[PDB]
Design a protein around this ligand. Structure first.
Ligand SMILES: [Fe+3]
Ligand SMILES: [Fe+3]
Ligand code: NA
Length: 131
């Protein structure tokens, strides 16, 4: 049972690149979720690291477009990104020190974050970025 399922109704932004990057995030989170129910710590870490790298790139992609187009709520939206990047960096620090584990609570938090962020934050840039 996949943790996350993308639909257009719930998550579509009317912005092609963003919808595509979102669908990749959901697939990479789903993979990490399944791995996080095991004790395969090396595989957990590789999938965690891949997912974080991709998310940071997604945020940059959204920010570069918002800023270039003079989107009204760019700085607020970047602030929400930058707080999750700080949480991700802190988790990588603790995980790669052997001080914290990644488990299905970790991936449920990323789920919770995304399923709030996409509809309530990302969908707001649609009109600007699809114009
Ligand atoms: Fe997004
Ligand atoms: Fe965003
Ligand atoms: Na995300």
């Amino acid at each position: 049972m996949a943790l996350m399922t993308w639909t257009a109704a719930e998550f579509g932004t009317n912005v092609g690149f963003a919808d595509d990057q979102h669908k990749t995030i959901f697939d990479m989170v789903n993979k990490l979720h399944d791995t996080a129910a095991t004790g395969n710590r090396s595989e957990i870490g590789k999938q965690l690291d891949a997912l974080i790298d991709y998310v940071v790139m997604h945020f940059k992609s959204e920010e570069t477009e918002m800023q270039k187009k003079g989107y009204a709520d760019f700085a607020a939206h970047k602030a929400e990104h930058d707080k999750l990047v700080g949480v991700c960096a802190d988790l990588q620090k603790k995980f790669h020190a052997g001080e914290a584990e990644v488990n299905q609570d970790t991936t449920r938090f990323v789920r919770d974050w995304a399923v709030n962020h996409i509809p309530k934050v990302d969908k707001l840039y649609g009109p600007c970025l699809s114009a």
